[PDB]
Design an enzyme around this catalytic site. Structure first.
Site, mmCIF file in Angstrom:
data_model
loop_
_atom_site.group_PDB
_atom_site.id
_atom_site.type_symbol
_atom_site.label_atom_id
_atom_site.label_comp_id
_atom_site.label_asym_id
_atom_site.label_seq_id
_atom_site.Cartn_x
_atom_site.Cartn_y
_atom_site.Cartn_z
ATOM 1 N N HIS A 1 0.813 -1.223 0.000
ATOM 2 C CA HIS A 1 0.000 0.000 0.000
ATOM 3 C C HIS A 1 0.847 1.274 0.000
ATOM 4 O O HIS A 1 0.314 2.382 0.145
ATOM 5 C CB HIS A 1 -0.912 0.044 1.236
ATOM 6 C CG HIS A 1 -1.785 -1.160 1.398
ATOM 7 N ND1 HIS A 1 -3.084 -1.205 0.936
ATOM 8 C CD2 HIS A 1 -1.553 -2.358 1.983
ATOM 9 C CE1 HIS A 1 -3.609 -2.382 1.224
ATOM 10 N NE2 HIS A 1 -2.699 -3.102 1.855
ATOM 11 N N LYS B 1 -9.450 13.361 4.443
ATOM 12 C CA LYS B 1 -8.433 12.314 4.408
ATOM 13 C C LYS B 1 -7.467 12.649 5.533
ATOM 14 O O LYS B 1 -7.495 13.764 6.058
ATOM 15 C CB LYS B 1 -7.681 12.287 3.061
ATOM 16 C CG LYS B 1 -7.160 13.647 2.596
ATOM 17 C CD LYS B 1 -6.642 13.639 1.155
ATOM 18 C CE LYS B 1 -7.768 13.540 0.118
ATOM 19 N NZ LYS B 1 -7.748 12.219 -0.568
ATOM 20 N N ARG B 2 -6.616 11.695 5.902
ATOM 21 C CA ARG B 2 -5.586 11.942 6.913
ATOM 22 C C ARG B 2 -4.672 13.096 6.500
ATOM 23 O O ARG B 2 -4.411 13.295 5.311
ATOM 24 C CB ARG B 2 -4.773 10.671 7.174
ATOM 25 C CG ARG B 2 -5.555 9.563 7.888
ATOM 26 C CD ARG B 2 -5.953 9.979 9.298
ATOM 27 N NE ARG B 2 -4.770 10.175 10.130
ATOM 28 C CZ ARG B 2 -4.307 9.282 10.997
ATOM 29 N NH1 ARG B 2 -4.941 8.128 11.175
ATOM 30 N NH2 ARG B 2 -3.216 9.549 11.699
ATOM 31 N N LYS C 1 -0.452 14.512 0.625
ATOM 32 C CA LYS C 1 -1.853 14.728 0.234
ATOM 33 C C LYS C 1 -2.151 16.208 -0.057
ATOM 34 O O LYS C 1 -3.201 16.549 -0.618
ATOM 35 C CB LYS C 1 -2.801 14.171 1.302
ATOM 36 C CG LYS C 1 -2.782 12.639 1.394
ATOM 37 C CD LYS C 1 -3.410 12.147 2.695
ATOM 38 C CE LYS C 1 -3.587 10.620 2.738
ATOM 39 N NZ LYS C 1 -4.585 10.124 1.718
ATOM 40 N N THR D 1 -9.083 5.766 -1.886
ATOM 41 C CA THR D 1 -10.407 5.130 -1.907
ATOM 42 C C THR D 1 -11.494 6.162 -1.648
ATOM 43 O O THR D 1 -12.650 5.968 -2.038
ATOM 44 C CB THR D 1 -10.548 4.003 -0.857
ATOM 45 O OG1 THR D 1 -10.067 4.469 0.408
ATOM 46 C CG2 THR D 1 -9.773 2.755 -1.282
ATOM 47 N N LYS E 1 -15.437 6.983 -3.289
ATOM 48 C CA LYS E 1 -16.625 7.332 -2.503
ATOM 49 C C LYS E 1 -17.311 8.576 -3.068
ATOM 50 O O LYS E 1 -18.529 8.586 -3.276
ATOM 51 C CB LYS E 1 -16.255 7.551 -1.024
ATOM 52 C CG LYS E 1 -15.676 6.322 -0.317
ATOM 53 C CD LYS E 1 -15.095 6.678 1.052
ATOM 54 C CE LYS E 1 -14.134 5.607 1.570
ATOM 55 N NZ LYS E 1 -13.530 6.034 2.878
HETATM 56 O O1 LIG Z 1 0.334 2.661 4.313
HETATM 57 C C1 LIG Z 1 -0.653 3.005 4.970
HETATM 58 N N1 LIG Z 1 -0.686 3.077 6.307
HETATM 59 C C2 LIG Z 1 0.345 2.801 7.132
HETATM 60 C C3 LIG Z 1 1.666 2.703 6.672
HETATM 61 C C4 LIG Z 1 2.693 2.423 7.573
HETATM 62 C C5 LIG Z 1 2.371 2.243 8.918
HETATM 63 C C6 LIG Z 1 1.042 2.353 9.327
HETATM 64 N N2 LIG Z 1 0.084 2.623 8.445
HETATM 65 C C7 LIG Z 1 -1.921 3.364 4.187
HETATM 66 O O2 LIG Z 1 -2.936 3.710 4.792
HETATM 67 N N3 LIG Z 1 -1.852 3.282 2.860
HETATM 68 C C8 LIG Z 1 -3.013 3.601 2.024
HETATM 69 O O3 LIG Z 1 -3.650 2.359 1.633
HETATM 70 C C9 LIG Z 1 -4.865 2.602 0.881
HETATM 71 C C10 LIG Z 1 -5.533 1.241 0.628
HETATM 72 O O4 LIG Z 1 -4.761 0.477 -0.312
HETATM 73 C C11 LIG Z 1 -4.547 3.378 -0.422
HETATM 74 O O5 LIG Z 1 -5.762 3.705 -1.105
HETATM 75 C C12 LIG Z 1 -3.752 4.667 -0.132
HETATM 76 O O6 LIG Z 1 -3.281 5.244 -1.355
HETATM 77 C C13 LIG Z 1 -2.555 4.395 0.793
HETATM 78 O O7 LIG Z 1 -1.955 5.630 1.204
#
Ligand SMILES: O=C(Nc1ccccn1)C(=O)N[C@@H]1O[C@H](CO)[C@@H](O)[C@H](O)[C@H]1O
Length: 812
Positions: free
Chosen positions: A354, A545-546, A551, A653, A657
């Site tokens: 991700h 979003k966060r 972002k 995502t 939405k």
């Molecule tokens: O990497 C993420 N969180 C994280 C990383 C390291 C430690 C703790 N938490 C994360 O939330 N990634 C997100 O995953 C979404 C689902 O695939 C994508 O749509 C989105 O682009 C992406 O930023």
């Protein structure tokens, strides 16, 4: 009106009678209340228990069905499940919404007021956690024997308070009044081991002298859409093991240390902090889960058949320890030879990535692993030796490739790269949007792709059209059902039929009517909960979003100030009124993100009180952005802000939405934005800014923010406002760190997209001035959002990775 919505099912006379009866039964026997003392909360709980009873038969039957049929079982391992509320979702999926609505109405209660009492199960940070939740829904809807596995945090993502314009964090005590949806299973509690040491002996290796932490499972039903399937989310809770005044007492109090493992979610988005407690949580989930997997496998009818009956999906590298843990179990306990155990492990495991940002990758110090999990480190080293032997055989003499591919990272602190471990130990590796999966093969994991190209896949993300259309936007779901029936609810590609209505006067009217209804309702929410007034006759411009620099909430800030400055320069000139809404949580230890929130509120402090501006422009920070708030604001949105620097958002995502809910999108060619624009036609998207190629070209010559400052008078004005204290008169230098970062240390090139962003936003306002054409473009967006159903995503996982065929077939 409410009850006239056909997608919400039937209010059968006997059903309504039964519901009322059971509502009253629970109020009496379960809650021990009378109508004299009963609060709205009591009534919510009476309804929750009433609705929950309807899951039970299906839940038992579904799990019995899987035992009898013996299909391949899918284990979805995640440190996060961003579930949101459960009451409405359960009613929707069981076709009980109109019945309960009628039942509660006849009892003199407003069911929507009751729904607002439920706390979110906020056991996730953002997109990754919410993806897991959408995936659970879709896997149940597609009739898969799928099991979500994670950790039952006592405290989820912190509740965000805005005080003096700053984020304050408070504990998310979501279990205060209990959780009526979960079933505690203390009888199925399992031991998880930590620390200790390895003894290599007569039978081989032995992990001894460990400290035990018990894993108590809590099972939550996951209902499919009207197919009578109810799957299970199992979340583990940490429990101290069974076995002087001060001494005895302290020993009892010290049970808290072990139990702290499941206390609180680490609130990071796209960032790795190598905390030991986090490592314990990760292993906690992995160890207990794999015990369940092994036991259930043995109760199905030698480990040659294991990958035919088991799939383990790793949601990021967070549960990556499943790879060495499975090897440990198969080799040390089941006494398989290494080679066979490894064949089994790779065929069982698959890894979903991700991430893009290097600081997001999990790289655990070897000393920490040696201390906490000595046997796992031994196994990791052995995995690495054999894997690098394979690289050396495939690419003889390529020494740097060996260094690049090693699971072991050299340096001041020697670390294990968990992504490398996952690729080596998985038969499939996927990114979460086409652009992202391509860059994994192209650059990020290029050498791994060259070794094993067949491993690398794409699985573009999706969202569930149950929660994200039928629940949150019944008004839109209804006008769609009126034209095309209800099949689209679990066959979202059928929304393409709506392109036949781009010139349909009734549909154009109804799409715009629904949007306005949603905007009035959200305005009512802000007035009721926060006494904040928003102009209902303004464009709702939303970025939720966060809070992260990639972002680019800051780019949004620059535009907002541009709009303000342009009004002040030419006050007589008409502009499309806007309510600019930004919301999202900052990680508690992320200074810049916290400063960015303060800047949003500070911009608002000036703009919202300038009499020349009035109701033409307003900037508000939406407090405590969470799944339940997303369900409120997204259906009310006109403009969706998806403005990450090209190459930084893996998929997104929230973008999906908004598209599904009748907002138009302003965005970069990043993540799934690219595929969203492909589906709808680029003419129907407000695409702007650098492409990835342009970003890379800037990187090649060096990004000089000064050049943009020197060439753009309007940007120059804003920076000087921020520096001089225009947005912080009582503390002139407040935003110096933001200005310094923008001028000298901006990794995300905010200034480079400023001009195209402002120009693109002008085109947004131009279209909004034409309600008919705005709405027609909206129809072209909703109609082509079908690809972004998580049913599509999960069907791909099932067929292309798990080797199982999805089915919409109903259970008796
Ligand atoms: O990497 C993420 N969180 C994280 C990383 C390291 C430690 C703790 N938490 C994360 O939330 N990634 C997100 O995953 C979404 C689902 O695939 C994508 O749509 C989105 O682009 C992406 O930023």
């Amino acid at each position: 009106k409410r009850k006239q919505i056909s997608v919400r099912g039937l209010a059968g006379v006997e059903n309504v009678t039964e519901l009322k009866k059971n509502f009253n039964r629970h109020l009496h026997f379960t809650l021990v209340k009378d109508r004299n003392v009963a609060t709205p909360r009591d009534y919510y709980f009476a309804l929750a228990h009433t609705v929950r009873d309807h899951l039970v038969g299906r839940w038992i039957r579904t799990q019995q069905h899987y035992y009898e049929k013996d299909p391949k079982r899918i284990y979805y391992l995640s440190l996060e499940f961003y579930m949101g509320r459960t009451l409405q979702n359960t009613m929707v999926n069981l076709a009980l919404e109109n019945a309960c609505d009628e039942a509660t109405y006849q009892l003199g209660l407003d069911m929507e007021e009751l729904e607002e009492i439920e706390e979110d199960a906020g056991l996730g940070n953002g997109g990754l956690g919410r993806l897991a939740a959408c995936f659970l829904d879709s896997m149940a809807t597609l009739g898969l024997a799928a099991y979500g596995y994670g950790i039952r945090y006592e405290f989820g993502i912190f509740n965000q308070k805005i005080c003096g314009g700053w984020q304050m964090e408070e504990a998310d005590d979501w279990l205060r009044y209990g959780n009526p949806w979960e079933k505690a299973r203390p009888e199925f509690t399992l031991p998880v081991h930590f620390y200790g040491r390895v003894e290599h002996t007569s039978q081989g290796a032995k992990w001894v002298d460990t400290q035990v932490v018990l894993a108590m499972p809590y099972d939550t039903p996951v209902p499919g859409y009207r197919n009578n399937v109810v799957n299970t989310m199992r979340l583990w809770s940490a429990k101290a093991p069974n076995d002087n005044v001060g001494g005895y007492i302290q020993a009892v109090l010290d049970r808290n240390l072990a139990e702290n493992i499941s206390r609180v979610l680490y609130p990071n988005d796209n960032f790795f902090e190598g905390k030991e407690l986090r490592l314990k949580q990760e292993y906690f989930v992995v160890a207990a889960t794999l015990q369940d997997i092994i036991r259930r496998f043995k109760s199905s009818k030698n480990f040659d058949a294991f990958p035919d009956k088991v799939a383990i999906q790793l949601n990021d590298t967070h549960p990556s320890l499943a790879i060495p843990e499975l090897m440990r179990v198969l080799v040390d306990l089941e006494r398989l030879d290494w080679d066979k155990a490894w064949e089994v492990t790779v065929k069982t495991c698959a890894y979903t990535n991700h991430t893009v940002l290097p600081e997001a990758l999990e790289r655990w110090p070897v000393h920490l692993l040696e201390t906490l999990l000595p046997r796992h480190l031994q196994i990791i080293y052995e995995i690495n030796q054999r894997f690098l032997n394979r690289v050396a055989a495939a690419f003889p003499g390529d020494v740097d490739r060996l260094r690049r591919m090693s699971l072991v990272e050299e340096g001041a602190v020697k670390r294990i790269n968990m992504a490398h471990l996952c690729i080596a130990g998985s038969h499939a590796v996927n990114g979460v949007a086409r652009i992202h999966s391509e860059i994994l093969k192209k650059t990020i994991f290029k050498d791994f792709y060259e070794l094993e190209p067949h491993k690398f896949q794409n699985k573009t993300n999706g969202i569930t059209p149950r929660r994200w259309l039928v629940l949150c936007n019944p008004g839109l779901a209804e006008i769609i059902a009126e034209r095309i029936g209800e099949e689209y609810i679990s066959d979202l590609d059928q929304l393409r039929k709506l392109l036949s209505y781009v010139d349909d006067e009734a549909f154009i009217r109804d799409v715009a009517k629904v949007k306005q209804e949603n905007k009035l309702k959200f305005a009512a929410y802000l007035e009721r909960e926060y006494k904040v007034h928003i102009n209902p006759n303004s464009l709702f411009d939303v970025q939720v979003k966060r809070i992260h620099e990639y972002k680019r909430q800051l780019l949004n800030c620059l535009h907002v100030i541009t709009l303000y400055n342009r009004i002040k320069k030419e006050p007589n000139k008409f502009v499309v009124p806007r309510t600019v809404m930004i919301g999202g949580k900052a990680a508690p230890g992320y200074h810049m993100a916290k400063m960015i929130i303060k800047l949003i509120t500070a911009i608002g402090d000036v703009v919202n009180h300038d009499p020349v501006v009035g109701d033409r422009l307003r900037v508000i920070f939406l407090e405590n952005y969470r799944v339940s708030l997303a369900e409120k604001v997204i259906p009310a949105a006109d403009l969706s802000e998806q403005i990450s620097t090209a190459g930084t958002e893996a998929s997104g995502t929230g973008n999906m939405k908004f598209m599904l809910n009748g907002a138009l999108t302003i965005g970069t060619m990043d993540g799934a934005n690219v595929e969203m624009a492909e589906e709808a036609g680029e003419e129907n998207f407000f695409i702007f800014g650098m492409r990835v190629e342009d970003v890379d070209r800037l990187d090649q010559r060096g990004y000089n923010a000064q050049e943009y400052y020197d060439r753009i008078p309007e940007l120059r004005q804003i920076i000087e406002q921020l520096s001089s204290g225009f947005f912080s008169p009582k503390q002139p230098d407040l935003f110096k760190d933001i200005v310094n970062m923008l001028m000298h240390h901006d990794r995300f090139k905010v200034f480079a997209d400023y001009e195209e962003y402002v120009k693109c936003q002008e085109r947004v306002s131009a279209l909004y001035k034409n309600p008919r054409e705005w709405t027609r473009m909206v129809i072209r967006n909703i109609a082509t959002s079908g690809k972004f159903s998580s049913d599509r995503t999960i069907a791909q996982y099932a067929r292309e990775i798990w080797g199982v065929e999805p089915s919409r077939q109903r259970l008796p």
